[PDB]
Amino acid sequence: QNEDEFGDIVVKTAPDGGVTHLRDIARIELDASEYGLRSLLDNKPAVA
């Protein structure tokens, strides 16, 4: 549901018992699905 749960993802489990989490290797943020276009209205953030 959120960024921190996505950080908890186990990308590698060490043989002794040790867990490497997704936050260890990446930054997890909520954002846009693509970035090709921007929209301003009089130089303030907007959507048409």
């Binding site: 908890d8 186990v10 489990t13 018992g17 867990v19």
Partner: protein, 48 residues
């Protein structure tokens, strides 16, 4: 919203340290309790 049900909580860290895949837990629950559909078989020329 007050029909009786069951909640099943899966310990993710305990699963991955114990060597069990979280998709494997969910797959067991689904197949055993939820009746997965696998593929079709033919009977009297009809697909079932």
């Amino acid at each position: 919203i007050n029909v009786p049900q069951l909640n099943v909580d899966l310990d993710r860290v305990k699963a991955k340290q114990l060597g069990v895949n979280v998709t494997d837990v969910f797959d067991t629950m689904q197949i055993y309790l939820g009746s997965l559909y696998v593929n079709d078989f033919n009977r009297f020329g009809r697909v079932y």
